[PDB]
Amino acid sequence: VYSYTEKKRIRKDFGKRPQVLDVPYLLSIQLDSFQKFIEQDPEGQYGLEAAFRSVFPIQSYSGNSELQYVSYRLGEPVFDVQECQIRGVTYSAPLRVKLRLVIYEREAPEGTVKDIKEQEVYMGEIPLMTDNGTFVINGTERVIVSQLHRSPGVFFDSDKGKTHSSGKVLYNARIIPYRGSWLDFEFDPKDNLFVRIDRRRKLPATIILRALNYTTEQILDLFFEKVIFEIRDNKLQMELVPERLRGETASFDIEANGKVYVEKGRRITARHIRQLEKDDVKLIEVPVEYIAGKVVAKDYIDESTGELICAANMELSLDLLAKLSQSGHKRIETLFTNDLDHGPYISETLRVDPTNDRLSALVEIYRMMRPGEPPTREAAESLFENLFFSEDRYDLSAVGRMKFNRSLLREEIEGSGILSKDDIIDVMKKLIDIRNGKGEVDDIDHLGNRRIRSVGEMAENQFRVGLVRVERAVKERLSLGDLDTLMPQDMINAKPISAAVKEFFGSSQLSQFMDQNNPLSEITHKRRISALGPGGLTRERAGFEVRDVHPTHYGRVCPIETPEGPNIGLINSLSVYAQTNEYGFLETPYRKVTDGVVTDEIHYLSAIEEGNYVIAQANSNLDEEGHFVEDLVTCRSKGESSLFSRDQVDYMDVSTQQVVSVGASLIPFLEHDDANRALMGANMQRQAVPTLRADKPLVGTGMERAVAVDSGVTAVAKRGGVVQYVDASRIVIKVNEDEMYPGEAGIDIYNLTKYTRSNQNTCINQMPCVSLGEPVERGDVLADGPSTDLGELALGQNMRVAFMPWNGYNFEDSILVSERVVQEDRFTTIHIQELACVSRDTKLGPEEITADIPNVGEAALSKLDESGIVYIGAEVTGGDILVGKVTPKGETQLTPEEKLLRAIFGEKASDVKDSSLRVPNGVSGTVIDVQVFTRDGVEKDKRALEIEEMQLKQAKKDLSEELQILEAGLFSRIRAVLVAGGVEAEKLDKLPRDRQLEQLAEQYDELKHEFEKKLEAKRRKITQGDDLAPGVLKIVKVYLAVKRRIQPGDKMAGRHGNKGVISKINPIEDMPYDENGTPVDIVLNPLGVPSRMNIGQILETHLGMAAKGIGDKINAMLKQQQEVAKLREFIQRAYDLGADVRQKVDLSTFSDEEVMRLAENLRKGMPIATPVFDGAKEAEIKELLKLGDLPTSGQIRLYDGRTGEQFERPVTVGYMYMLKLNHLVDDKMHARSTGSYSLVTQQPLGGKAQFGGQRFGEMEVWALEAYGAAYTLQEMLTVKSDDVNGRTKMYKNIVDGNHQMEPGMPESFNVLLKEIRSLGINIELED
Amino acid sequence: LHPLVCAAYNADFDGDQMAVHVPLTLEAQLEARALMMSTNNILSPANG
Amino acid sequence: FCARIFGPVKDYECLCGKYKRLKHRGVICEKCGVEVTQTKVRRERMGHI
Amino acid sequence: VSKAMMDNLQTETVINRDGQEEKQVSFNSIYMMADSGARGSAAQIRQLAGMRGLMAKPDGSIIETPITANFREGLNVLQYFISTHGARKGLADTALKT
Amino acid sequence: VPLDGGRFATSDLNDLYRRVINRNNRLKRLLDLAAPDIIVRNEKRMLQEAVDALLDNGRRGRAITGSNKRPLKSLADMIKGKQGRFRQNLLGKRVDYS
């Protein structure tokens, strides 16, 4: 129950639902996809294997050099995470691929000439997902947010109110593809069913029908029914179709030989259908009234006379059919239809088409597709058919076809991949029966029409496009070479792949810049759902319908969690218990309740099946056995919470967590505070600030350890063992054999994230939590990351907060903070920034990294050495010099009075100058790491050598340790043989340490040869092994880090929804203190509650103090020197107040040494884990507080430290939890008002962070044009903001002093002015 | 800032971003304290 | 980019660098009639086709 | 509910001086807010100490099953989940109209 | 302005007047050599667009420069731009003193 680390810190688990399914790895979805991606796969695991197979084989024609595929071998991590993050190089691994090339002979029955299979082709270096779990490429950790777009199928969205403009509004239908073309289908009450492509116009549905060679006769014979009408004994009989009389009005007496069943007057509803079905009305006497509107499906003329009457598909009028009742006809086959329910819609659409033939109908399509040259047939055929019928590029898998058939009401959930003519007809009929009023409309909100994508899915398709750019670059070589000319590593490319791999893991609109500064910050900015994705929901298309919430999201998607800012509304997070299906779906864990007994068997349902079965919420009271104690419960039938019997319920939600995400589950008592505050809260999560000493949150959910321990932020262990060689760089573990694989002896290597860089200038911080000398377990930690203590997520920090208005210092968001924090570094964040200097090569000659620094002051010298670099560990602030950069002056700059010197005297004694690089305004830290590289082939100055020595020893210092351990082993072997053949304890203890005979003899020697050849190799690599790009040859990489503490204006908040900014620095004890002794540090005002429903301020605070009270008694039960038994029963009450709800007890080992220490670590309160949507309540909280004697009412009376008086009505004071964001103003507070402008014109040079400035636009121009102040208006658009000469000519006088200005001549006018002069216009200024 | 002016600005004390423009000439300066000063225009162009 | 058609390369400075001093602010070379002048005036100096 | 919390919260505070216990305007801060005012409506405060009433349904009409609880205590998941739809509403609107 | 390497950073307008004046002499050359009207006016067609391409190209197709796909910045394009009047209006020189 308790492990090696639980010996020190335990979180009070408190679940209301006795669980059967326990929490899994928090970042499942992400990390295991990485495992599937970069690994040996013998079949086709979604990742590098799926992509390559969906594109392979690469088949060409005439010659056949069909390139086939087998497998691929990868590379393991070469260096440690430490220096990879410090040097600033992509933490990747070489990708070697096994490509097979079978060259066939030109036109011979598969006569293979060569089946040459070559491996390890260099297809780049794929960026590795660290042990932490990020894509470290350009120094900044970047991770891809899993996405979601429209699932393949067909939707029917309403979207009312947007485009009615009269009252005759309609809806829209969009058939969604997977990898192909989207399809538009729209039927309107305007009596016109249209259809078009994304880049099309308004064309009838009959333009595809007639184009598929389906003539008028071929069309209306499929869409409409064949009814056998007959004329017997010279009188019209009719095979009345009741199913085709739905909604029809009874105008004529509907009879059956004398018995009028349906009366003339009241109509047909859905009862008289049965009253006509029961008597089988299929051959009755009827007038010709009812038929005088049907078009014929054949041809009929006078056979007794010899006269032609009509063609095909035409209504038969009063006299025509009468003639067809006297000449010689006994059969009549018209298309049975009416005018209310079933309508002759397409009969009214063929007329819309100007043509009637396939030929010209495609010419109409040619007018749409390509307007230009006079038409023929070539163009048509090609485009159109190869779009929907060619299967090579048009596909739909088994997900698209399912929603097809199921929504089209079929049974087979599989089919083809293309879209056929019979489907064009049938899916059209779908829209047709939805226009009749015999069918209904669906909704996009249904996750069946919502494809939830994994990073791997997105991967295959983006890279699929890359493979086509290169496939049609290889097929040329393949078509030409008959013999064995084309050889491996001469066809496949690398750049189109390089600008693709880097492009997806860090440049596509799926991947985002992960802001690293907290474990959860990483997590929620990593795994979520992003509609921003490629081909997903964009903000210029998705409206209000797309953003609506529906109970069909209960169990997988979180409409709750969606960050504030650029990407808002289009997120709707993925769940922790969520598992992306093999293709595109997502399965939700529900317990099977069989008519009474709730079975612990968990199932996986889809969005169709969820909305198809009766499922119970997480709010379903079970008791004693786990079965419903009640006989009724709220259940979703299709996504509607209604009432159901116990003998009908089929499901119930497993646990109170099998419904939400990382950012949703993380917040305690979500049911009580508003979820929109969780939306805003969603944003704030991925921005938690790195504190130095993270004290633990007094309250949680049980996913706190799920973050801290399982986020990669800590050096975990896959094979537990006795910690051995633990350092601040790498941790070495001696593995125990009960958990050891006999391979490679037993030395597990681990790398630490001990203070390195991060995207937002951050500095990831690792805090060692385990002391040396103790075995670990599979899943045990060594050193937890930022804002974590011994394994608990403490994003911000928990401390004393009181609620009392001071009129001025705390208006809602305004936070009243006390000196304490910033003064003690109990909340300090660290920040490392990075800079670098581009290299040499000039039209004149090489360049030097200064190697000095000419004509400067004393300061600029005491810091730059003979390498041109600043002493690491010096004082680099403001704008001190960092890297000395030399630049070849040039022909263009030379001077008359200086020449001849550099023409006689020497060579480089003058031509070179100094154009170094300095510290960007806004940085005050210390230069730390410096990595430099020199001129490949033709070595640089002394620096080349300074680099070699440096690196040689950096590597030696490590490779020596691990051998000294093993050599200690061989030491033992010799001391074991020596004694038996002559005891020499004292003798070997007096002789130097260098004083199975054949065994040792051989192995020792092999080792020595390696030593030699390896040192040679390293030196070799830095002399001429500098494989770099031409140009980047003398480059520099320098990092500068600054200790940053919170200053007035920083954004602190909470995990709930209330924000805030630190205000005026306040003294220490001028804040009201209490019975404990600690003066309150934070002061806010719940004035926002009576206004917005963020009840956390009343509540979260109350309960916060509760949990700390229990800690105050732990404090008591230890400070009094109490035996382990006293507090043991205290722990029993802690896990057994008086219920059956889980907390999971122990009762197995020594309750002495391993319970007493737990008090020594929980004397700071006892963190409680609460259930998300059915959590702890009032009566429970109070039960705990009466155990000894605690402040059940966390609303204690405060003594004002200003003097010593008591305030009226004791207030809600105690411990709550704050959440500071990454919004440290030192990233945006780079003061700039006057500096340098543009050269060519009045162009503004500045971005968002550094070199900032207020954007004065034309609308702000109107503000100035809106106030009575016309003088500042004058200035603002003349001298203050227009004339480049105006300000210069005036600044050089204001520095001298003169209170008044003069306009001059605006150069802008000088443009317009002369321009019109070319035309013939005159400017005139007289008198 | 003086609290009794925030009503006009419809703001409080918790994050209102404002820019400070420097009058380079007496022109701006004179309008500043004459027709722009808080204490010199306690009326609104909508009524009293 | 002509001296006679448009104007002085630099302020009162000839391209051949013959004329330098301010007193010869209007002198016209018998060959190249180029009056040395302020380059600012080389915004008003229009040419024709 | 209004007819209750208003009389209660306007004069229930009585104190004796120069005679018997005279009725003085409630010293309760909510009362002072509902008198001069600073920021925040006493109508939403009213729906904080009293039943929130009705909200908008996920369809558009008005809830046929009113919230009978108050925000002094922690009101129920499901009804507040329908109140979650209300949150949606507000936020969005402000956002684009500006 | 010449660069370190031997290249020239001439402007779009320069290669435009070059064009106009080159064909201008070519037209006067069709005068020195006496060509029929069918041909001298063929060059007039070429000089016609010349004038245009300099101003704003009026409305033809925005004359481009040799080997570079980019509509040249004409006279009216030195006027027109962002938010009506390019410079003075939209983004008109970074504010000083504020």
UniProtKB/Swiss-Prot annotation, chain A:
GO biological process annotations for this chain's record? DNA-templated transcription
Q: Which key words are in the record?
A: Acetylation, DNA-directed RNA polymerase, Nucleotidyltransferase, Transcription, Transferase
Q: Which reaction does it catalyse?
A: RNA(n) + a ribonucleoside 5'-triphosphate = RNA(n+1) + diphosphate
Gene3D superfamilies on file: 2.40.50.100, 2.40.50.150, 3.90.1100.10, 6.10.140.1670, DNA-directed RNA polymerase, beta subunit, external 1 domain, DNA-directed RNA polymerase, subunit 2, domain 6, RNA polymerase alpha subunit dimerisation domain, RNA polymerase Rpb2, domain 2
EC numbers listed for it are 2.7.7.6
One cellular component GO annotation, for this chain's record?
DNA-directed RNA polymerase complex
Recorded hits in SUPFAM superfamilies, A to Z, give: beta and beta-prime subunits of DNA dependent RNA-polymerase (SSF64484)
For this protein, what is any one GO molecular function term? DNA binding
Taxonomy, superkingdom = Bacteria
Residues that the record marks as modified (N6-acetyllysine) are: K1008, K1186
Cited Pfam families: RNA_pol_Rpb2_1, RNA_pol_Rpb2_2, RNA_pol_Rpb2_3, RNA_pol_Rpb2_45, RNA_pol_Rpb2_6, RNA_pol_Rpb2_7
What enzyme class is recorded for this protein?
A: transferase
Q: Which PANTHER family match?
A: DNA-DIRECTED RNA POLYMERASE I SUBUNIT 2
Q: Which family is this protein grouped under?
A: Belongs to the RNA polymerase beta chain family.
NCBIfam families per record: PRK00405.1, rpoB
Q: Assembly and partners?
A: The RNAP catalytic core consists of 2 alpha, 1 beta, 1 beta' and 1 omega subunit. When a sigma factor is associated with the core the holoenzyme is formed, which can initiate transcription.
Question: What does it do?
Answer: DNA-dependent RNA polymerase catalyzes the transcription of DNA into RNA using the four ribonucleoside triphosphates as substrates.
Its recorded name reads DNA-directed RNA polymerase subunit beta
Q: Which organism is it from?
A: Escherichia coli O45:K1 (strain S88 / ExPEC)
Curated annotation (Swiss-Prot), chain E:
Q: Give the highest taxon in the source lineage.
A: Bacteria
In the record, the note on similarity to other proteins reads: Belongs to the RNA polymerase beta' chain family.
Q: What function is annotated for this protein?
A: DNA-dependent RNA polymerase catalyzes the transcription of DNA into RNA using the four ribonucleoside triphosphates as substrates.
Q: How does it assemble?
A: The RNAP catalytic core consists of 2 alpha, 1 beta, 1 beta' and 1 omega subunit. When a sigma factor is associated with the core the holoenzyme is formed, which can initiate transcription.
Spell out the protein name for this chain: DNA-directed RNA polymerase subunit beta'
Taxonomy of origin reads: Bacteria, Pseudomonadati, Pseudomonadota, Gammaproteobacteria, Enterobacterales
The coding gene here is rpoC
Question: Shown portion of the whole protein?
Answer: 253 to 350 of 1407
